[PDB]
Every structure is written in structure tokens, then in C-alpha cells.
Ligand binder design. Structure first.
Ligand SMILES: CN[C@@H]1[C@H](O)[C@H](NC)[C@H]2O[C@@]3(O)C(=O)C[C@@H](C)O[C@H]3O[C@@H]2[C@H]1O
Ligand SMILES: [K+]
Ligand SMILES: [K+]
Ligand SMILES: [K+]
Ligand SMILES: [K+]
Ligand SMILES: [K+]
Ligand SMILES: [K+]
Ligand SMILES: [Mg+2]
Ligand SMILES: [Mg+2]
Ligand SMILES: [Mg+2]
Ligand SMILES: [Mg+2]
Ligand SMILES: [Mg+2]
Ligand SMILES: [Mg+2]
Ligand SMILES: [Mg+2]
Ligand SMILES: [Mg+2]
Ligand SMILES: [Mg+2]
Ligand SMILES: [Mg+2]
Ligand SMILES: [Mg+2]
Lengths: 80, 131, 163, 87, 200, 134
RNA sequence: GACGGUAUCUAACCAGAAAGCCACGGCUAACUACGUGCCAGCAGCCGCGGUAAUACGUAGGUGGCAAGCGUUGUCCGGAUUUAUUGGGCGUAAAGCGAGCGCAGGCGGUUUCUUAAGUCUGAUGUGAAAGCCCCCGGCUCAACCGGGGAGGGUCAUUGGAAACU
RNA sequence: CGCGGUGCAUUAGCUAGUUGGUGAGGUAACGGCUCACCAAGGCCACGAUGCAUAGCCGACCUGAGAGGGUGAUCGGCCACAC
């Protein structure tokens, strides 16, 4: 069975019910100079019971669109 | 503050060679020991030794000068810098002066010269050029 | 030191510059000639000579170049390796070239290399275009060139081990 | 439908053809799914190179050869092989 | 286009004998024009390189564009000296093959024969003087054309043929047994200068 | 600069400008705007014809024409060659090219095209000056 | 069988119908005569012309190219003249008047561990056509065809742990 | 859905079905896609918004390369048909 993309990120907003905003915080190389530049990509994830809190390391798996911007489903709360 | 101890070691060697000093001393580290032994076995430096102290140890290098006090080490250049790391794939391993020099590289097999790196067919981080 | 004698040297007048000294009565024009003398087998030098007449300037320059000979190491028809020679505004980068590629050089560098006997080499002048300075930079790079055997002797290794 | 048909190539007054599998709607020289062979009519005995395994698989899947491609496959015996497979 | 003007003036502009005899440089061995007999200043290095390139392309009677393309082809060859390879390709040019076989006295005559179709490569008519002749191909006079005083005289008169060309006078059939060598070709040309010229 | 400096504020190259701006802009009557179209030449009507004084090093009467182009820009163009048939309201074709002597002349008038007549008696470089082979 | 009596082949006659363009002061290969007299004009830059101009016009020669030649238009290069490869800031342009400092960039030695970066193998893909490498077909070439290679800061997966 | 390919900050705030939720309806189908309620959320100096320009690409020209420029013919995708 095919695998959907899973990301590890940090919660930066939980003031919405049944959802959270997570940040991936990857690094990329500058095309010209080759230095690693910080890059913050953040997604909206559906929380079933608002378990996650702000500033928590979590895992999210991409899913079918659940709202206008929701595209991910919470899996774990790695740290608080 | 000192941000590139490897580059500092290279510069110490460069200056000592420039003034034709017989020996030099540096604060010790694993990477510095690796570089020193590579130079030792490549014949760029006459000898290496270590002293155990209570900070980090000291590494002493005895330089090598040929007949007429000709300098064996022409120069050293730091390639991978904290500001800009440099990595090369196995095919991209550089040849210094068509092999007359060497390129010290850190790889998953350890710190080795470019010859050894391309013999093993692996890349790594190009620590320095020496010639 | 390279003895000019016993070497069948040839001369090339790289550039003749008309240099003026201003005097009470006007201008005293003179000719300064830069000459490259070479054996086309690994020995070359350059000289400057100043005189009122072009022939005398050339003669003095030739004598100076003779006295200022140097040896250029050469592997096959090209130089052992890449090298950058810097002198004043002069900055010349020289690279070994494959057999038969020709002298990919410009200006006085062409004269220097041809008279030294290098037949295939690439080069680029990244600095000033003044003939004297570019010639000086070229000779500095050539003196920076090294021989594989001498490198092996210095490093206490065999040439195969080095390569 | 899926057609096993000839895509023209070559030069003016010197045609060459590639036997390719493509959607019938796609342009003659445009989009195609997969190449299966070649066809050179300028040779007195018409030269043909064929990936007979692919051709048979597509025929089983329901590709419809054009008239000339059907002639080519008949000459090559692929059509007989597919008929036997159906049997 | 083909050059149809004088040959002696071109040869003495080049400072060498294109015919290989020196007949052109025997009298007035200097450049044509009213300024020929009186001396002139030194030629620049660019002039020397241009003179060498012109030497080659006038030797083989080729236009500059075709010369460039053939030079690039020669460069493509990985082994050997670039200038030597270019010389070898120039030799392998069909006109030069006929001239070396001696079926014509001059390269212009050889080219005219090839163009008019009096030559056949491996028994098949070839009218392309630019045709590249591989080693071992047989160049023969067209059977209908074999009875012409021009080629008969050329064959009988030609006394020396390059070591790399094998020839049979009775069949009027020749070929190359191997690639020409630098020494075997015109030594008075400096292929290195042409190489540098096209290096620009 | 440091690598981080370059990352933050990358290199930016100078923008070059055309030496013959008028040829680079077309005109659309409908929208009444100017289009950015590169053209090797452009047609214009000679609004004025006369002579101009060179700059200090040179003394002559350089022959010039003030021309309104098809794109409605007014420029000044030189008249190469010796003698011309141009008059105000004469249709001419303009090519790029500066004139060192003249301060504000950036274009030349193509001889032998449109109203411009070829330079009479010309026998060398006839392709320039637009005269047929005699 | 539109192309089409087209490609192509054969035979006969005639050097007879078939060469222009730009440039020649230096850059830059190519030089002299007159006419002209800061006028006429040339010119990409330097700059030529004021009565003996190799720089204008013409003629003769010469050089480059060639059924093309030259001008203009525009892109890249030369240009290290935005310098990652690959520049600098005392006097040439360039160190903020100086400091405190959030974020950011960078960061001492060393044990273990991880595997994000890093290196490495496999799989899938990066269409065809096009560049490039072989091999064939057009009399050669262009052109055409067959077979490969290449092309990702790619996705999954297995390794290595020196450096970050 | 991740990632990549334009300039301007002498464009700094933008957003109100907007952000999310519970229902209902709708769609081949997920979905504020639409509607009724509930809360006030969401984007933004990692450049939101706005302004100007532009079809994108395989590819093509140039360069030693890195790169720069272009997006005709041919092929892929998209958009348009006063
Ligand atoms: C006072 N007599 C003067 C004096 O001797 C000058 N020397 C300082 C001298 O200088 C000359 O010899 C020069 O070289 C200069 C020239 C203008 O006059 C010449 O004649 C100059 C003499 O006329
Ligand atoms: K001139
Ligand atoms: K730099
Ligand atoms: K200061
Ligand atoms: K790792
Ligand atoms: K809803
Ligand atoms: K519309
Ligand atoms: Mg001196
Ligand atoms: Mg048939
Ligand atoms: Mg042609
Ligand atoms: Mg000249
Ligand atoms: Mg002129
Ligand atoms: Mg003139
Ligand atoms: Mg540049
Ligand atoms: Mg000042
Ligand atoms: Mg200043
Ligand atoms: Mg548009
Ligand atoms: Mg460049």
C-alpha cells in the first residue's frame, strides 16, 4: 500500500478547535552560493481532540483535504 | 573568537614555514591529529608528537626542509570553511597540482587524502589543500 | 644562475615604448625596448634597454635578457601543472594543455612561452596589460612551476608514490 | 480507442514510419503511448523491426491496428500468434 | 564557389610553392602587386597565423566555411595532434587522393576530373570533390573516361607517389594503404599556427 | 562580502541601455501606446533638413535631418555621402549609429531606400550610399 | 500514384550563357598615384581633412569572404565591469560618528548515540524529438534512421559515521 | 500535495466565507464548494498585499565552466475563439 507523506514539526497555533498549525523547519541550499538556509514550511493539521498544545513536537500524515486549508492529520505528540 | 581551529592550524603551519621555523605547537584535537599524521606520512612535515596537558593536549610539529633549506610545504589552503562548507562527490575529488600536492578530506572512512578517497570511490568534505 | 653562453639564443622585441623626459628646452625622447631571449628548449629571460635609437635599445635589452635567464620546467610540450604568477598589475594564470592544443596565450605571454619552448599551454591575464609587468608575472609563474622529481626528493617519496 | 499505428518520420519524399501505440484522438506525429516497432517502405522488401511481446500485450489489452499495421503484423506472424492466444 | 584566378600570385602571396615545383616562385619570389618587389615591414603574429591558414586552404582549394567545419571535425578526434589530424583529413579529401595518385598533374585538374565524374570510388561514380576517402577504398578512372590524353599524360609523367598511396597504372586504380604522416606531408606548413589561429 | 552577506543581499548587475533608443519602441494607434519592439530600421518623415556644426575638434557643415518616426518619436539623423535629394516631408528610413562630431545625432539615414537617393558618382563602397553598379 | 514523365540514367554540342561584396593609419590581413584643401566628407574608438592626405573622392594594385558580401537591430563573450568558481574599501569608489543589543550567521575540547546535512549502492522515473558517442542510409554534406550516454539540489529503499 | 523557475519595500500590512468547527445541501468526488449557526481565526520581513511584466517546458544561442539570454519552427501541457 502506498505511503502518504509524514512530517515532523512543531505546533505554533492551537487557538482553532479541532486543528493545529505545525512548522516543518527544514534547511535548503542557496542555488548560487550553496549555503544551507533555514526554511520554515507550516501546515494545518486536523486534531481530533485538541490534544496537542503550542510548542509541541508532533507528527502529521498528509490526508485528503479536510477543509479549505487542512491537508494533514495528527499522529503523535513527540514532545510537549 | 576563534571559529575555525583547523584553518588556524593551517595558518600557524603556513607562517612557521614562511619564517622557516623548526617546530610549532598547537592546541590538540582529533581532526588536527589526523591532519598532522597525514602530512607526516605524506612527507610534508618532518615529524609529529603529542603532549598530554590538562586542557586539551598539545600537538607539536617538526617541519621538513630540504637541501639548501628549501621549503617542502609550498602552501596550505582551507577549502571547507564554517561560513561555507565544501563537499565533493567521489568523482569530484580534486587533484592538487595534478597530484603533486594533496587534498585532505574527511569521509565516512575517516580523514584521508584525495588519492585514497578516489581509490575507495567515496566523497566527503574537503578539509584542505596542501602543496 | 643560467649561463647565457653555450645556448643558441634567439631574441624577440616584445614592445618598444617611446619615453619622454621633459627638459628646459623641451622634450628628450628616448626608446625603451623590452626584449625576450630564449632557447626554445626550457631557458628564457627578459631585459629592458633604454637608448636614443631603436637598435641600441634592442641591443641593450638583449644583453639584459641574456644576463637574466631562467629555466622553465616542462613536461612533454606543456608545463607540469597550473600556476598563477603575480607581479604588480600583472597577474597571469597558466594551465597545462593537451598535446597539440597550441599556445592559447596572448600578448607578451605568447613571446615568453614560445621562446621558452612551450608548445601547448593555456593562459589568461587577469591583471594589467602592461608588457613589462605581464612578462614579469609570467616569469614568476614559471619560477613557481615545480618538477615532479624534485618534489619527490623533497618529500622523501618515489614519483609513483607521489602520483 | 488505443491504436497501433504509423507515426511518420524522416524527410520530404523519403518517408519512414514508427509503429507506435497511441490514443486514436492524439495527432499523427503528436502524443503517443509507446513505440513498438519501425517500418521502412522505401526498401523493396519492406524492412520491419517489431517488439512482438509488447505488440501482443497491447493487442490482448485491446489495441486496434490500422490497416497497414495489420498488414505488417500479418506478414510478421504476430496476428496469427494473437489469434492462437485468443483460441 | 571555386577559385579560378592565377595560381602563381596566390603561391607567392603565401611565400611557398603550392604546385610543389617552385615554378611559381622561380621569378619574383615575393608577393604580387606594385608593392611586391620593394621590401615591407615585419608581419605581425596574426599575419603569420593567417598566412599559415591560407597556405593550407589554398593548398587544398577549399572555401573558408568548409575549412572551418573540417577543422572542427579534426578537433573532435580524441587521439593525436589536432593539427596533424586536420592535415590527414585534408589529405583524405577526394581531390587530394586523386592528386596523390597522380591521375592529375595539379589539384585543380584533379578536382575538375572528380567534379565532371571521370573518377569512380569502388566502381561507383562520385562527383563530390569534398568526398572523404577512407583507407582502403579504390579510386579508379571512369571506364568511358580512361581514354583521355590529360589523365594518360598525368599518370605517365608522375614519377613519385607518396609511400602511403598504392597505385596500379594499368588499371588506373589507386588507394591509401594507411593514413598519411606529418613528415610525409608538406613539412613547410606549421599546423600549430593554424590551430592557434582557429583558437582565435 | 561574506557568504551570508551575499545570501541576504545577492549580487545585482548594471542594466545596460540601448545606444539607439528610438528603434526599440513601436507604436500602436489603437491603444495609442508605445510597444517595445526591436527593429533594425524605422521609417520616418523628415520634419526639417539642414546643416549642423561639428564639435570643437572638427569644422564642417554636417548634413542632418530632423525626422518624426512611425512610432511618433522625433530624432535627428545624419545624411551620409555627398549630396542628397531630401526635403521636409520626405519619407526616409533610419538605421542606428552614432556620430562623434554631432552631439545629438544617434541615427543615420539609409541611402538608396525610400526617398533617399543613392550618392551620385559613388564607385566604391556602393552598398553603403546605395548606388547601383554602373 | 497528386507529386509526375518528378528523382534518376543514357547519348550529342559548346568554354561557350553563369562573381560579386567589403576593407587596406593602429586595433587588423591588405599601399601607391592623383583630385581636395578644417571645404567636401570619413569615423566602432583613438582620431583624419588647414595646398605634397597610405584615414575624404577617384584610379591602379592588394587583403578577407564568396553567391554571397557589408550596415543596422538584439543576446552571449571578451567584462574578474556584481568576482560562489572569481574583485575590493589608508591616499583611486568604497568602514556606518560611536556604542547596547532582539532575531539571524558563526562558534572551544572530548565519550556515547542518532542519521537532518554529508558520502555511497539498488529500484522507479526525468516522454518523443533535440545536443553528444557509436553504427547505418541518401554519390558526399546538410538531412534521415537504429542503438547508447547524458540530464534531478527527484521519490522509495540499504549501507558508512570522519565533519556539520 | 513537497519542491523549482520574474522585478519593485520610493509597495507593510492583508483577510470577513475570511480561518476553523457542528450541521445541512451540492458535486463523479474531498473540500466554505454553498448555506444556517458557533468561535475569532488565518496570511505576513522565510516578503503577505499591491504594482509592472510574462503563457510554462523539452529545448535553442553564448560561455572553459559557473553562468547569462531566449521560449520561432518541432513535441508536451495550459488558456482563448468579436
Ligand atoms: C645662462 N645660460 C643658459 C644656461 O647655461 C642654461 N643652463 C642652466 C642652458 O641650458 C641649455 O643648455 C639647455 O639644455 C636648455 C636650453 C633651453 O638652453 C640651453 O642653453 C642655456 C644657456 O643659455
Ligand atoms: K581606416
Ligand atoms: K568572491
Ligand atoms: K571608523
Ligand atoms: K547523517
Ligand atoms: K464546514
Ligand atoms: K474569453
Ligand atoms: Mg631592472
Ligand atoms: Mg515495396
Ligand atoms: Mg556555400
Ligand atoms: Mg597591417
Ligand atoms: Mg568609408
Ligand atoms: Mg581613401
Ligand atoms: Mg562577466
Ligand atoms: Mg579625494
Ligand atoms: Mg576616497
Ligand atoms: Mg501577454
Ligand atoms: Mg567568461
Amino acid at each position: 500500500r502506498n505511503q502518504r507523506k509524514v512530517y515532523q514539526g512543531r505546533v505554533v497555533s492551537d487557538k482553532m478547535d479541532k486543528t493545529i498549525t505545525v512548522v516543518v523547519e527544514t534547511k535548503k541550499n542557496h542555488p548560487i552560493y550553496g549555503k544551507r538556509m533555514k526554511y520554515s514550511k507550516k501546515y494545518k493539521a486536523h486534531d481530533e481532540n485538541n490534544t496537542a498544545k503550542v510548542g509541541d513536537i508532533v507528527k502529521i500524515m498528509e490526508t485528503r483535504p479536510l477543509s479549505a486549508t487542512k491537508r494533514f492529520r495528527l499522529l503523535e505528540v513527540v514532545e510537549e | 573568537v576563534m571559529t575555525d581551529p583547523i584553518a588556524d592550524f593551517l595558518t600557524r603551519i603556513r607562517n612557521a614555514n614562511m619564517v622557516k621555523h623548526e617546530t610549532l605547537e598547537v592546541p590538540a584535537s582529533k581532526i588536527k591529529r589526523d591532519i598532522a599524521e597525514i602530512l607526516k606520512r605524506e612527507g610534508f612535515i618532518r615529524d609529529v608528537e603529542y603532549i598530554e596537558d590538562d586542557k586539551q593536549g598539545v600537538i607539536r610539529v617538526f617541519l621538513k626542509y630540504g637541501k639548501n633549506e628549501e621549503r617542502v610545504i609550498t602552501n596550505l589552503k582551507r577549502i571547507s570553511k564554517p561560513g561555507l562548507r565544501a563537499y565533493v562527490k567521489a568523482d569530484e575529488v580534486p587533484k592538487v597540482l595534478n597530484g603533486l600536492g594533496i587534498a585532505i578530506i574527511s569521509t565516512s572512512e575517516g580523514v584521508i587524502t584525495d588519492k585514497e578517497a578516489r581509490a575507495k570511490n567515496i566523497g566527503g568534505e574537503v578539509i584542505a589543500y596542501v602543496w | 644562475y643560467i649561463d647565457p653562453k653555450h645556448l643558441e639564443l634567439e631574441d624577440r622585441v616584445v614592445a618598444i615604448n617611446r619615453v619622454t623626459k621633459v627638459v628646459k628646452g623641451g622634450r628628450r625622447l628616448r626608446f625603451a625596448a623590452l626584449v625576450v631571449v630564449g632557447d626554445k628548449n626550457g631557458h628564457v629571460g627578459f631585459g629592458t634597454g633604454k637608448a636614443q635609437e631603436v637598435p641600441e635599445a634592442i641591443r641593450k635589452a638583449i644583453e639584459d635578457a641574456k644576463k637574466n635567464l631562467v629555466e622553465v620546467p616542462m613536461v612533454g610540450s606543456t608545463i607540469p601543472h597550473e600556476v598563477i604568477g603575480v607581479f604588480g598589475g600583472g597577474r597571469i594564470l597558466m594551465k597545462p594543455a593537451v598535446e597539440g592544443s597550441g599556445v592559447a596565450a596572448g600578448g607578451p605571454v605568447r613571446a615568453v612561452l614560445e621562446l621558452a619552448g612551450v608548445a601547448d599551454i593555456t593562459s589568461k591575464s587577469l591583471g594589467s596589460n602592461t608588457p613589462i609587468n605581464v612578462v614579469r608575472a609570467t616569469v614568476e609563474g614559471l619560477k613557481q612551476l615545480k618538477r615532479a622529481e624534485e618534489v619527490a626528493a623533497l618529500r622523501g617519496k618515489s614519483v609513483e608514490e607521489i602520483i | 480507442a488505443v491504436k497501433i499505428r504509423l507515426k511518420r518520420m524522416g524527410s520530404k519524399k523519403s518517408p519512414f514510419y514508427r509503429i507506435v501505440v497511441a490514443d486514436s484522438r492524439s495527432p499523427r506525429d503528436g502524443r503517443f503511448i509507446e513505440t513498438v516497432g519501425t517500418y521502412n517502405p522505401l526498401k523493396d522488401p519492406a524492412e520491419v523491426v517489431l517488439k512482438e511481446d509488447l505488440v501482443l500485450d497491447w493487442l490482448s489489452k485491446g489495441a486496434q491496428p490500422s490497416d497497414t499495421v495489420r498488414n505488417i503484423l500479418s506478414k510478421e506472424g504476430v496476428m496469427k500468434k494473437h489469434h492462437e492466444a485468443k483460441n | 564557389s571555386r577559385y579560378t584566378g592565377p595560381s602563381w600570385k596566390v603561391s607567392r602571396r603565401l611565400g611557398i610553392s603550392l604546385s610543389g615545383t617552385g615554378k611559381e616562385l622561380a621569378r619574383r619570389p615575393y608577393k604580387p602587386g606594385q608593392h611586391g618587389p620593394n621590401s615591407r615591414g615585419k608581419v605581425s603574429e596574426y599575419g603569420m597565423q593567417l598566412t599559415e591558414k591560407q597556405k593550407l586552404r589554398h593548398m587544398y582549394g577549399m572555401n573558408e566555411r568548409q575549412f572551418r567545419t573540417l577543422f572542427i571535425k579534426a578537433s573532435k578526434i580524441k587521439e593525436g595532434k589536432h593539427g596533424v589530424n586536420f592535415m590527414v583529413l585534408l589529405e583524405q579529401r577526394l581531390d587530394n587522393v586523386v592528386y596523390r595518385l597522380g591521375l592529375a598533374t595539379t589539384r585543380r585538374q584533379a578536382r575538375q576530373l572528380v567534379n565532371h565524374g571521370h573518377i569512380t570510388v569502388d566502381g561507383k561514380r562520385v562527383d563530390i570533390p569534398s568526398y572523404h576517402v577512407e583507407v582502403g577504398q579504390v579510386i579508379g578512372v571512369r571506364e568511358k573516361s580512361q581514354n583521355i590524353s590529360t589523365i594518360k599524360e598525368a599518370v605517365e609523367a608522375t614519377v613519385g607517389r607518396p609511400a602511403f598511396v598504392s597505385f596500379d597504372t594499368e588499371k588506373l586504380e589507386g588507394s591509401f594503404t594507411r593514413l598519411p604522416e606529418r613528415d610525409e606531408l608538406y613539412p613547410e606548413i606549421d599546423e600549430a599556427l593554424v590551430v592557434e589561429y582557429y583558437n582565435q | 562580502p561574506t557568504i551570508n552577506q551575499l545570501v541576504r543581499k545577492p549580487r545585482k548587475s548594471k542594466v545596460e541601455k540601448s545606444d539607439s533608443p528610438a528603434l526599440n519602441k513601436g507604436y500602436n494607434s489603437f491603444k495609442k501606446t508605445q510597444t517595445n519592439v526591436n527593429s533594425p530600421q524605422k521609417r520616418g518623415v523628415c520634419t526639417r533638413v539642414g546643416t549642423m556644426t561639428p564639435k570643437k575638434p572638427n569644422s564642417a557643415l554636417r548634413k542632418y535631418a530632423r525626422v518624426r518616426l512611425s512610432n511618433l518619436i522625433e530624432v535627428t539623423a545624419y545624411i551620409p555621402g555627398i549630396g542628397h535629394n531630401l526635403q521636409e516631408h520626405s519619407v526616409v528610413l533610419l538605421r542606428g549609429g552614432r556620430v562623434k562630431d554631432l552631439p545629438g545625432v544617434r541615427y543615420h539615414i539609409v541611402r538608396g531606400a525610400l526617398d533617399t537617393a543613392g550618392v551620385n558618382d559613388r564607385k566604391q563602397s556602393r552598398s553603403k550610399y546605395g548606388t547601383k553598379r554602373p
